[PDB]
Nucleic acid binder design. Sequence first.
DNA 1: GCTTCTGTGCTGATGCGTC
DNA 2: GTCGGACTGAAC
DNA 3: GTTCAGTCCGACGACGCATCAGCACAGAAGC
Lengths: 301, 246, 252, 255, 640
Amino acid sequence: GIQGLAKLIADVAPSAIRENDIKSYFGRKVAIDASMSIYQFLITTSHLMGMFYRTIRMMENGIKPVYVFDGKPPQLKSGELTKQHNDECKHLLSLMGIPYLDAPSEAEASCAALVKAGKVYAAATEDMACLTFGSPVLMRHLTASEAKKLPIQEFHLSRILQELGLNQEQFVDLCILLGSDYCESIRGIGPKRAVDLIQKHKSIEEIVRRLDPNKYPVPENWLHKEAHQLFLEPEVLDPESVELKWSEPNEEELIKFMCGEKQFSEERIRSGVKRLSKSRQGSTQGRLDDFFKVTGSLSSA
Amino acid sequence: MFEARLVQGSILKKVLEALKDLINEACWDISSSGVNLQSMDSSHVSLVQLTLRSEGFDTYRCDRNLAMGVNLTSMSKILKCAGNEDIITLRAEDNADTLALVFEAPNQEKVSDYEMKLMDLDVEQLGIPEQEYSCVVKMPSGEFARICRDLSHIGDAVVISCAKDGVKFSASGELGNGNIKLSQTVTIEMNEPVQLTFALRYLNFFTKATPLSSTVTLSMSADVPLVVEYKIADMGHLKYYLAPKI
Amino acid sequence: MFEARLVQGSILKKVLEALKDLINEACWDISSSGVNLQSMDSSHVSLVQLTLRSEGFDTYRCDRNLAMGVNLTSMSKILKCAGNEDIITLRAEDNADTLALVFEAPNQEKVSDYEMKLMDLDVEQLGIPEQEYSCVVKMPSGEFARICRDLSHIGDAVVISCAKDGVKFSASGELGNGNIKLSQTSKEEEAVTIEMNEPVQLTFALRYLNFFTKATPLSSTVTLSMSADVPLVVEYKIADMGHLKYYLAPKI
Amino acid sequence: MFEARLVQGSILKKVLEALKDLINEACWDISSSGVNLQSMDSSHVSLVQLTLRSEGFDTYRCDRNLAMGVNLTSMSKILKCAGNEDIITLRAEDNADTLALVFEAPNQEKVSDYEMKLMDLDVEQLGIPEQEYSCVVKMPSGEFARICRDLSHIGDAVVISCAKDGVKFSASGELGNGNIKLSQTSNVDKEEEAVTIEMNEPVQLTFALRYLNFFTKATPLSSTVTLSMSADVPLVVEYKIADMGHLKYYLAPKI
Amino acid sequence: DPSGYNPAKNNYHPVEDACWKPGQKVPYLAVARTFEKIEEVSARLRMVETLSNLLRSVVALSPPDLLPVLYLSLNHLGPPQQGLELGVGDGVLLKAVAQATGRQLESVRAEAAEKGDVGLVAENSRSTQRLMLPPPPLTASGVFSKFRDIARLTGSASTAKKIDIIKGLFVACRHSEARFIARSLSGRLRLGLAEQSVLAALSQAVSLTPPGQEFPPAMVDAGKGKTAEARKTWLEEQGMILKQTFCEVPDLDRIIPVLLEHGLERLPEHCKLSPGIPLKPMLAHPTRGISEVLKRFEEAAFTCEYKYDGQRAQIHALEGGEVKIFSRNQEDNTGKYPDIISRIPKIKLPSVTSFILDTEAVAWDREKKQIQPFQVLTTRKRKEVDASEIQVQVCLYAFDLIYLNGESLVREPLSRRRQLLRENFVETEGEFVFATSLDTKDIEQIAEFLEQSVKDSCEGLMVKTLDVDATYEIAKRSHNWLKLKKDYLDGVGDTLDLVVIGAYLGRGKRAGRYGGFLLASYDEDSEELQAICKLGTGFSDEELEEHHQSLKALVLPSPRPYVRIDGAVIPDHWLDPSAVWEVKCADLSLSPIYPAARGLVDSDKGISLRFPRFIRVREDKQPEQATTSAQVACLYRKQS
DNA sequence: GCTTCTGTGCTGATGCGTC
DNA sequence: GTCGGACTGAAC
DNA sequence: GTTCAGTCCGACGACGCATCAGCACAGAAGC
Ligand SMILES: *O=P([O])([O])O[C][C]1O[C](N2[C]=NC3=C2N=[C]N=C3[N])[C]([O])[C]1[O]
């Protein structure tokens, strides 16, 4: 994920940072990036053990998960300088009644495309790439285990963009300059510079050309262009090409193989498939803004 | 400048006893029309509307609309003193951080006044549209309250069934299940049959307002927030809006 | 299977409310003669015998003898939601897994029903032989409860004394001893009558009396029976329907 | 050697309960004239004085002047164990280590008895002079009790100010401020329900609401009470217990 | 008139310069004036002088008021064997001040935080709450009676009863006694002087003016005509008599009355040591390594001992069959281990009547047959003595002998003591054993036994001499045994490098600056800082001043979201995390309060440092480069 | 049915004793 | 538990 | 004759059994 931009926001605009708790997100469809999620699940069935139990935990509090898998990754600076366990996760999605999407590229772009088009209200990832892809709401830290307390952090892209006044492209350029996975950035100018330089020079291209000293280490191959067009219009699937629906979960089909390929507590898994199934009797309660429009806010003098 | 006088002060006690609990901090909008207040609850699953028209005020003056944010637990503690039949009078200055209250006893003997501190509070407001409800039930609030309490004693999911032939309330808990019915002897008006489900984890908080009015009305339609409404004399009414349990 | 109806639902309301703090689960035994419930407490120190005779109700229909294990706290949470004046009805099947409770209001605008989960329990049944208790006393219930509320306030044990024309409660502790004096009366709206054989004195736990005391609205008159070192019998006469009998161990 | 029977034991209940909250151990002096109870609080802020006279007792007989040291808690509970209407008889003899209480019921069939352990007690005696008071007010017991029960929620101390037009309470604190101006019940002399003020000079002072909440407990003995306030002087609150006695309280000011 | 009472005047006369008449109970105002004169002085021997002046005055005018004014300076409320304690919190005191001064709690808390001292804010303020009677001036006997009443009064609503009594004492102050009452109630009297120095000022007073003189005192300066140096030599040899007399029997209730009624030279004739009274146990000195042990014990033939991680226990067996068990800090802990009291028939040989022994008690695994950590012992229950259901078993390790069959052994060589220990008891495997000791002067076996101990679950090494200085008497030197810690023996230990996140205001000597800190580890799989410990020790005065002067501008008014804290103390300031401080740790442990490292071993229980110590401000780093919770877990695994 | 409260735990918050 | 801190003694 | 050398005193820290406070509600009493 983009280096340090959470720090810039948490120092300049904590107001768009909303600490909230799990039961506040009832009914919500959530677009989960499968790649970073299975990556933390590996930290040999442990990747499946998190894939089972974290999915259960989400289902309990009205949250409907949308797992999005990666396609062709773009020309990473590190990566351009196996799917046995990946498809192992695709196996139990159908076997537990959860949908699987496959994105044309980095699934964080396809999760953000889904959010910005109304099909889903929140995502599930730790990386701010989805905010930079235009997702108005980011929901983070959900995928953590039950003991690691982690209340769930909202970010509001609309509020962030409004408070500084600096548009989406004037937020993509921030991310690139502040240190993306696509290229190095200018290690000679501090991370605090990003909001102020964007306020004074709302592009990376205008930002570099004004100051040309030997002390300003702009990238040796200056990929601060190409990432801007990538985050503007990434290689994503059509959201309405896949109407999300959450199916009846299997009561026995997973467990007949689950303890079989990886010997583990029968009682935990059988109770898990029961509890996730009973949570589907909930997921019911809704919210007034869906029925009645916001006339606006009324401000006291 | 705000000045309103009201001989029926005892209803304000009953109003603030109900509003306080679902909304700890709330904002009145004071207008030439009289006083109103709207706010949503914590989960954004319900909201309240208070309406009181200026027609019922013993004297009123207002040069412009005023927005006053107030903690309702403070007003409840204040009015836990004011006497059961007192005249209640409210006053405010053009830009003050305080609201004045003046209370006169019926016997003129015990005369009280207070001056509370305001706080700055801006809250979101939702503009409810006018609509007709496929079911309207009009019935005494005291039985409705008892039924809601009796059902959340067992289980939190309530089903409310409304039709020409009667009203039904169904629920169940880990101990088993129950059903209650009401017969036209309660009055029902309908256009289409409706049956919905809601959470008594808000209806037993709603039914606090039993002292505010002798009867309640329930307005319902398919996939629409239940409206529970209580009349306030001639001066106005109170409404609650609750999102359905899909 | 059986079906039973009584117009005065308050009777069974109180019959339940008397037992709720004694035992949390018990076997109700229902037969064509009537309903019986014999059980010890949570501590073996006491026993209850509750009996309701079939002819005491307005309508009774039992064709198969049956005993159900019952969670009494559950039925308390049932009946708390109904008015005292309503008609009660109970129905049971042969496959004893759910009981139907029906509430019929005197204003017929409301009639309601509830289905409760049954349980399997085996109460340790015992035999209670009837015996001539060397002292027995009948008295009005309201003061007997007041006396218990008073004596348990100063201490945890009470000593009865039963003489030929005089009965006394006593309790002693840090703040002193309290003596409650009863003299026989022989007519008024209520009377205390003594059926003596030999004089006696016994001791009992005031805590279990503080629980027993909830049966007071079920009867005007309560009858207390004892001998040397046998348990105290306490009977509340439940109309012409039957009786509720406590049996409480004496403290040595 | 002491014996004292009184028909309306309800007064005795009410006064013991009303004293419990402020003091746990106190002494009666019993004499052939009657009974007195002077006591001080552990903070030595609030002084109480009870007086009973023999003509208020129905059957009173004291020969030797005897001091009874008594813990209020045990004897208050003993009268909680008694009916209101019951005829109560205190009994003891010379150097008796135990106090006898007889409780008599109107049914003749119930005649209960309670023995209290006495204890050694020494109390400090203080000699507060009777004097004029700059302001005197008679108020219904309920109206002052309600004023204080209310104002306990607006602050911790009340700024009283009496005057010829009407007595003012005022206070301030965490949630705001609150004023109560009781006028004088002037045009209609109801007696049972009146507020009356007499004043040579106005007096204005500050006082503790914890102790006012402790004082107001004697409200069920009389429908009215009287307040004596004077500059720099401890507030006198008085409860005239019919024709059996007087109960008086002094409150150290917060000047 | 005590308002000008001046014990700083040269040549104090015990009766002529006092400010009350004899027979009267000692005015507490003078005790307060004298405490204010002591704190105004820095020189320790001048403080012992001024306290000796006042002890002499008391035994001249009002001998019975001796015992309380000791505790007014010693702050203790009785012999620790009784279990008496004041049991009042500093919050309760701050609310009592708010009631008695009439000031609201927020302002008084803010003032007390900026001054660091409840006693300073007890003055300069009034409630104007005028009583009708001006209060009786407190006596030192009365002050002590009210403090033991605060200790005695407990049960439901007890904090009201405590608040009332404390209010009463507070409004009865006259000039400056209130500050010292405020200190007195916290258990933090901050007098600048302690037990040994009060025993010294006592010894000087009771030697200048012995008891048994009738008034007016016939002798005032028992050192008269002697030169000050030879006076000092007589003072200090008498002071050593007193100290040894105090050491053989800890409680002033056995010492001070017999001191009045028999006099100071004949004290040991009555004061014999016996089973059933506890005795002051030996202390240990921190040494870094074996060359230091060899220079300290060059002439001293010495032996080696494991330092077991248990609790210190003294056992005192009477011939009638009752036996008691006592802690280091003197308390009666008997009935923590009633099963040991059930074991007494099998432990001693049939030829012996009574004894006193010292032992380390450690919890023992019955089927595993191994040691377990101090975190096992600390969770052991305390109040109930119920032996029917025993959860955690115990085994004993001997390390010294005090008393056998009617002979005192404290005065003797460790050689004859340990001989008589071995030759007069029976060992019971899994119940009670000798600590293993190896009897050599070769460094190899010593560093071998070091390794064997650190791998046999023990803390470090204990070193004891057999005869040279070996005796039990504390007064000559308290530290006769040596502790060889692993902590610096490795040259550098478990060093960690932690970011600053928060600061605590200073108090006492530290007041007017910062006084404590809160630190975080880095959690890179969240990009956030996990609070790991509070730091309060090992920084010097001028480097503390440098830490403050660097932190002054670094505050943030809000908590920045990059913090994780819970249950741990909410800090007085929030700090932007710009520097890292290298610190040292003694052990990792599973904190039920700290969030850091939760779930890497145990799900909810986080990790924190036993015995944290600051070391160095690591000025070159960036915050995220600091230690990770995964390394912290790795170290914890390596502890087993 | 209403009143204020009492008796009811359950969970939270420190004081003080190990080291 | 533990580390620093000010001062009298250590004794050359 | 002063840079060492040792005492002694209180700065501060981490856990955890006990044990009481502070809502919070059924409950009963009071009416
Ligand atoms: O001064 P410290 O607290 O570090 O050390 C004394 C402490 O060590 C423990 N101890 C373990 N084993 C011991 C021993 N002390 C004496 N002898 C042995 N053999 C004990 O807890 C002491 O209090």
